């Protein structure tokens with residue numbers, strides 16, 4: 001029943017500001033230090049900041065000192081990161097993490113949030129177009145059939161594809177012109193399609209877009 | 219600042235074998251009779267997860283095949299026996315001094331038998347044609363090793379770009395890779411040509427083709 005629920009990630013203009021939140025579900029932050037860490041698009045992990053149990057002690061990485069503020073509110077079981085003077089290279093997935101609470105020194109980060117995505121750019125939010133990828137109505141098949149969804153022309157990067165009907169393959173997005181393109185595939189037994197429903201659900205939080213595409217032959 | 223260096227950057231290991239990953243700190247991470255080096259696992263699309271705290275302590279909930287050891291400046295994480303499920307990037311991190319720092323990561327990959335891709339090709343959907351664009355998509359699925367080459371031929375002639383190729387991470391069950399190849403063109407250019415072919419090499423190439 002433990003989950004660290006993050007919010008606030010968004011597209012922001014260079015020099016802009018943004019506040020991230022992290023609230024503990026089924027877990028108490030009271031009694032424990034906490035950190036923020038980010039994963040930049042190259043997939044490296046970078047420690048950002050920490051804060052002690054009651055908030056007496058705060059420390060910042062060299063890359064964010066003077067621009068970011070870590071704080072917490074234990075009565076609301078919440079951790080915050082206030083970001084300001086944002087620049088391009090702050091673009092990253094931001095995780096909150098609770099520390100272990102052992103005596104005898106410092107502690108590892110034992111519980112981590114799901115990550116919230118921050119993009120720093122002058123470009124504008126563009127929702128995705130979603131196109132089905134299904135074989136032709138006549139086409140011979142078997143034993144399995146591969147289906148997919150093509151997600152095209154969106155910015156910023158963070159989209160999630162979910163299938164409802166199976167091996168799902170997720171292909172990382174790539175930049176075409178100013179916009180992102182990604183695809184996802186799923187493989188289903190020949191006998192179960194098109195008779196049984198298969199749907200890809202595509203979400204792009206930055207534009208508040210959620211698209212469900214039902215896969216049909218042709 | 220304590221700088222962490224991991225070795226190797228990538229390590230390939232067969233299922234059932236012992237995998238050993240190394241982390242060297244630029245100065246000691248020991249104090250109070252403990253060593254403040256911690257290890258994390260990160261799988262794609264998932265947050266980091268704590269494996270080992272304070273150099274040698276297994277975190278509750280983590281499989282017993284993980285262990286760690288070391289002191290001062292040298293630390294080791296051991297995965298034994300390695301499972302298909304362990305494909306991930308593994309990080310060391312120190313907390314002896316603020317600012318806290320991570321190592322650069324070590325990718326664990328599984329060594330496995332060669333496998334040819336299953337290839338699927340998709341013409342532009344009517345929806346997209348209706349919109350005014352045209353993308354032709356090819357999936358090459360469940361192949362090994364990761365190094366494979368894809369080429370497109372349009373009416374017999376090789377289209378080298380407007381082509382976007384993207385690989386998955388290694389599959390956590392069968393240890394294969396998959397990739398998507400997308401050829402984007404104008405609707406008008408799409409309809410000017412007849413034959414479309416996506417081809418995988420690496421030779422006896424595997425091919426899928428259609429005609430308009």
Ligand SMILES: CC(=O)N[C@H]1[C@H](OC[C@H]2O[C@H](OP(=O)(O)O)[C@H](NC(C)=O)[C@@H](O)[C@@H]2O)O[C@H](CO)[C@@H](OP(=O)(O)O)[C@@H]1O
Nearest residue numbers: 032033034051052053054055056057099105106107108313
């Ligand atoms: C020396 C020590 O305890 N260091 C830990 C450090 O401590 C900061 C601060 O924490 C408490 O203050 P509140 O913030 O008011 O709780 C502590 N007070 C009491 C009553 O214990 C102060 O004495 C102390 O100065 O904080 C960090 C984490 O926040 C610790 O790291 P880990 O979380 O990694 O353990 C560090 O050990």
